[PDB]
Ligand binder design. Structure first.
Ligand SMILES: Nc1nc2c(ncn2[C@@H]2O[C@@H]3COP(=O)(O)O[C@H]4[C@@H](O)[C@H](n5cnc6c(=O)[nH]c(N)nc65)O[C@@H]4COP(=O)(O)O[C@H]3[C@H]2O)c(=O)[nH]1
Ligand SMILES: Nc1nc2c(ncn2[C@@H]2O[C@@H]3COP(=O)(O)O[C@H]4[C@@H](O)[C@H](n5cnc6c(=O)[nH]c(N)nc65)O[C@@H]4COP(=O)(O)O[C@H]3[C@H]2O)c(=O)[nH]1
Lengths: 138, 137
């Protein structure tokens, strides 16, 4: 319902002038809005918390405690896990738990999995650490 | 030596008007600045990362993988680990690794331990789960 800029405004993590400056730049550059905001000083975690709320994802402050379930990992080929930015990590109540790197990929991943799923969002470094543990390059 | 408010303002978690507002409220209520800011929308994790930076602590996002070394837990009576909010979890390079629940207790704990130490900080639930693991019963 709410766009990213409005979400951040509502949470008090950007100012109206900071948002307008970003939207004015975007209309000249076409860069992703969150990228402009972060480049101008928005904490990257603030961006991801807002993006998670927008797509109904649970934001994961860390992936270090996750022990990836090998049987969940079989639900995506490694090449697909990397391309879609999705790590299946386990099961809860007959749903597969999946950690995304980019909320914009939730729908594409959900369609692919074609089963009940619970989605999480992790920061880039946290996501890559998790991916490598779930999908060793071996 | 930056105070918490300007630490958070520089990062961009709070506006300047929100900081002034929170300190004005604190003048009436006396609550901690971090608790007011968290009530006003600051993530608790962002608060603890700033508090860790301020006191030279390493903030731990998670304690789930830590297996507490019993040899290190011996360095504090359980009663002291609870009162000081400090869990010794192991040793690195001749320093004892200690996980604090509150960065304000760093100096008191360091004086007591009286040996080289590496200090970490953890959010309350993660700290409690680690404390029960290191100091069972
Ligand atoms: N992984 C990742 N995802 C990002 C990032 N920035 C945005 N996303 C998401 O990608 C979608 C397209 O972003 P946009 O290209 O900047 O296109 C934006 C942007 O041009 C504009 N916009 C965003 N917020 C506002 C606002 O508050 N006010 C106005 N007038 N326009 C806004 O509306 C369009 C739709 O925005 P949204 O519905 O929120 O949809 C956004 C948002 O869900 C990022 O840095 N990283
Ligand atoms: N466990 C926990 N610890 C917390 C929390 N908030 C602060 N601490 C820490 O406790 C000390 C006392 O916080 P305070 O009572 O709000 O008393 C504060 C506060 O009244 C004020 N203050 C803090 N930041 C600012 C600022 O940016 N500008 C101004 N003018 N005053 C500030 O200076 C005094 C000292 O602030 P600090 O040096 O940063 O020292 C702070 C900080 O290290 C919390 O929510 N939980």
């Amino acid at each position: 319902d709410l766009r990213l800029g409005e979400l951040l405004l509502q949470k008090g993590w950007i100012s109206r002038e900071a948002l307008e400056e970003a939207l004015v730049e975007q209309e000249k550059t076409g860069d992703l809005l969150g990228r402009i905001l972060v480049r101008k000083g928005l904490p990257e975690e603030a961006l991801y918390r807002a993006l998670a709320e927008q797509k109904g994802l649970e934001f994961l402050e860390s992936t270090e405690g996750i022990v990836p379930d090998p049987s969940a990992a079989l639900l995506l080929l490694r090449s697909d896990a990397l391309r879609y930015g999705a790590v299946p990590i386990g099961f809860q109540n007959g749903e597969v738990e999946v950690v995304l790197s980019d909320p914009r990929h939730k729908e594409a991943v959900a369609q692919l999995l074609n089963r009940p799923a619970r989605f999480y969002l992790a920061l880039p470094q946290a996501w890559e650490e998790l991916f490598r543990r779930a999908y060793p390059q071996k």
